[model samples]
Target chain A: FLNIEELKRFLNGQTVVSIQPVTGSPLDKTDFIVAMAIAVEQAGAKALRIEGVSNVAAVSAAVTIPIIGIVKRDLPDSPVRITPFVSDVDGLANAGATVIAFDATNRTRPESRERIAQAIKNTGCFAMADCSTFEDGLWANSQGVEIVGSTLSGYVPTVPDFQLVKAFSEAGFFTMAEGRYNTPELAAKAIESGAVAVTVGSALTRLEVVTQWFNNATQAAGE
Target chain B: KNFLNIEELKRFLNGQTVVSIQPVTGSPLDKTDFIVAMAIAVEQAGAKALRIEGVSNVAAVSAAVTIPIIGIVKRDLPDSPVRITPFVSDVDGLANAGATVIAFDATNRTRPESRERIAQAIKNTGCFAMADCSTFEDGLWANSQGVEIVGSTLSGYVGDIEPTVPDFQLVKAFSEAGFFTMAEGRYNTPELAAKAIESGAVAVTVGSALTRLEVVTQWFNNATQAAGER
Candidate 1:
């Protein structure tokens, strides 16, 4: 029931733990996703970043908190991996996503960043630009996208991208830090660096990767 | 994987951690491309070298980056647990696929051919030979035949009760015995990698952490299930 500005205020300086399964059918993940969403919401995350139109719709129905919705598509060798199409924004916004995120990188894409921003604005929903670098954040800001997310920094990294978060926020874009803030310390570091919010994925949802770290570290401790 | 010769590989192996990429079947990620990306990332992270499985992946990665590749082919021989490039034919395939060094299971298990021939097969292909062994006897036997590199990759993996830590004792055995040793199995963390060097390992080879996404995820999932304490 919150407006775009109200939801933006609610999400600022909050933790947004994302929920997605590394395995399982995309079609059959609704119940499991809703369960995970409820637990994280109960654990005090003000917002949840979810992928896929169906999952976002499911979680939005189940949780009162804001949902940062994205669509993940496989483009062999293309750099634009997150929410590259305007149609994706339409689907997510129609599915009740409070904040819709799309790739704002200058790489080859199906739709212009401006058109995608217009679509989100036309729906009266908040738009987030998932950016790779500071220059991308600047472009998103110039286009009037409501939020800038350092989502694809390094394609992946071991540490959170604090400098990019600080640059985006200091330069007047509402910024969220997303990549590799798997630890509590790193997540806190993101907010300290001026991020409006921090999103974590693997540490909270990817159990298999977490298990692999412990398995290898302790397997040979006895023998 | 390469410097020029075994001597060069030895020189490079000293006091560094090497990444090994083994992309499992049915992984959520892309197979060859995943291997190639990981190879790039580990090299970017300053890994001294990489241990890669499969011919096409080694070939693809070799083409993609400049890091040395310690290559091996895995085969299912019903009677033998010797999957690390057991045959000379396996060695040849890896060499042709741009593997700079070829590794084989040097354990004294039931196998098709002598360890002597696998090393010779690698030598014939102009690739370095690394012995992936389980015991101190295997290390001495491998070194006895002039193979210069011995890795503690199969130590706890081939045991009745596997140790929770890496085979540091075995690595120290090889190091104290004056062989260029690599501590591999269970050396996944930074402290463990450093401990491998302290135990006299010339280098440490890490695999599951850099690759095996599914396996790594499973480790954390089980730990948090309230099923048991680690």
Candidate 2:
């Protein structure tokens, strides 16, 4: 498996690029989703982060390489986590995803933590734990999870300026940083913090967010 | 003679055992995290049927999977809970949007006179009708009213007794009356799904148990509790 080599390379100082898809309205069409994946691949994204098994099937159908599959399921009365449980894993696996990620956070979802750990292990697909705090990283590694991610750091509760770099170094978990990492500087910091790969979305991909940044920068420069 | 390409719908429904769509209110303005929470909860838990407002979301989901869709167009009414429209125009949208089934409320609380006319129109167009009923009386009554399927969509908003698995008694009652029973509601567990199936329910519709993160996290927050302090 190239996983070990990939992990080694990531830790050694290579930056893996990823794309986050917003398949909400105005962009929910299959043609658009397919087109976007094509564009993302062409733009040098090493891997793509798309939600839903159907989305996985669609993207994989159109792309040539492996993808990092994530399902963004927001829960009632709790934080909207990317990965919810083992069944979620089953759905990703069924959709032919090469790698699967789940919430390996201190925050809990419906399934038991042990069961959640075992589910990822059982699926035989790469499991990525989404960590916000150091305790989150340690628990993910102790669970023998394949990857550690800083995806939820900036989105839920509060985006700590801190990432899981030190935690990943201490626990020896392969680190992936995703979510709201909006700039080249932030991406650089994430890698410096020991991130194996960095995903920049809503920052690089979405035009509305990008344009807003450009407009703000222009105005601030004038001031 | 309809000719805008109907086979697309067939392709979308192919090999799809579940259609897990969400019910999105059109107002992106209102803070209905609770409402969106319910929709997301339904989708995450392996729902075979997904209903959301607007064609863009439906088309997106259609592009997303081949799950048999129960398409709906949600409109918020300041006064009432019923929103789904089963008329020919609405059915035409579902058919064109690649939905296999269409869902609408059939509560006795308010019978839109066009209910019968709309049911016939949808059935004629080769789509099935999911009668969303609020009571066992309505479930039985709707089946007799010629709905292809009967779901115990028992008044979730009326704040009547919170519907639970035992509500399968109503499901069993509908089955005996010659209706294909779709036991839907807060039946929130795989165990309860099995139980509903055991109770003469043809199929069980569950939401919020598998996908409601808040519920799951709430349980987790409770489960991970610390011991009492001195």
Candidate 3:
């Protein structure tokens, strides 16, 4: 489970793959889910990220690929933004998942990060660190996690240039460039810099966002 | 027995299908105000029916009009695959809230009850039944279950399915199956509505096509922006 052998195996052959976490406010009424899953899968995602059980079922129904489920319920006491508890990982696991992830940001949790990481290990699942900085990645390494993700840094308003890649590389952790790496060039550069894999989502996967860019480009060209 | 007052709907069927108006997807207005405007417009336009959400909006819509309301209560349960009315209780609630017809997801995707069971419930209520279809297979399944009408309500917005003229594949399939096809969703013009009926829709349900101010404005904005006049 610590090795996340299934995910490790899938990562072996693919040069660049995506992991999209399904996001919606509490009010979404489970809309556009199948479309989201198909869009990500069709765009060559090796795995998917989703929140809550409904999305897990939804993404599972729409695609045949592996899913990295993370629950996003906001707790009153914590600053740990994504999938902050054991029950979060447990819900995703029960919903038919291949891997689980949680925030490894510089936020305090009720249980130690080690305890939370142990919960993922107890389920015989691969645990990826959803870390913000290299400091977070080194800390995850201290907790025995294999995969280090860049999602947290993007959500934060500030970071050093190439901070996420630099931190994970220095720690010798298997680095994953995710979040804000929307363009093809950015994804390639993230890999070139040090990332073992690049999780390209909104930049390469969604038609709506792409359409917006195309419309803007066409307007600019016309002008 | 399906208790939905079917005879009442049949009595009101004017052969002119209702103008399916839209709820502003994202807007500054509150839910109550939006539903009232939607009801008033549909009623004024001589629509025979109204498809709407079954909560505060349905209450507002029902209170605002006398039309045979087709209600769908969209709720996603933790354990259920269906987002539209997963249990009999939702039907009962919509009915009690004054929905004359109950519409729910009858897509090929899984649901709490089979199409037959849903149809049976509608039959027992004596109310109109609208199966919101996302695909030809969904329409067929609804028709097979003896649903009185099936709407291509999921077009353009559900399941990554694109919109098409004639929407010939779905329309022809529904027509071939001998069920009423209610074409709803993004039929943006009178010409397109005409094409839908010509393509074999029993009746066309126009939404943003005939109504929806913001959507029309956005289209105009896009046009203006294209012309560099913005």
| Best by the lDDT measure | 1
Question: B1-230, model 3: which lDDT tens digit per residue?
Answer: 24434344443442344555444544332245545654664465345566677555677778888776777777766665567665677777777777777887786556667656766776566657788877888877776677777777765545465654535467667777777666666655445555565666655565553334334333422322233221
Superposed by TM-score, candidate 1 places the C-alpha of residue A10 at a distance from the truth, in angstroms, of 23
Candidate 3: where is the Cα deviation over 4 Å? A1-223, B1-17, B76-82, B112-116, B155-158, B161-166
Alpha-carbon local distance difference test for all models? 0.74, 0.56, 0.60
Superior candidate under lDDT, 1 versus 2: 1
Interface RMSD of each: 11.7, 21.7, 17.7
Worst 10 residues of 1 chain A by lDDT: A214-223
Q: For candidate 2, what is the lDDT? A: 0.56
Model 1 alpha-carbon drift over 4 Å, by segment:
A1-223, B1-3, B227-230
* Ten residues in sequence with the least summed lDDT for candidate 1 chain B: B221-230
Best by DockQ: 1
lDDT for predicted candidate 1 compared with the true structure? 0.74
- RMSD to the true structure for each prediction, in A, is 11.2, 19.0, 16.1
lDDT (10s digit) by residue, model 3, range A123-197: 766778888777888888888787888877766542223666766766677777677654344555565566665
How would you encode candidate 1's per-residue C-alpha lDDT over A1-223 as one tens digit per residue? Answer: 4564566567665667777656442212566567667655654567788999999988888889888888888777676767877888889988888888888888776677788877887777788888899998888888878888898788735677789988987997778888987655566667767776777677656544543443343333312
TM of chain B, each: 0.92, 0.69, 0.79
Worst 10 residues of 2 chain B by lDDT: B221-230
**Per-model TM-score on C-alpha atoms:** 0.58, 0.45, 0.45
Q: Could you tell me the TM-score of candidate 1? A: 0.58
What's the DockQ for every one of the candidates?
Answer: 0.06, 0.03, 0.01
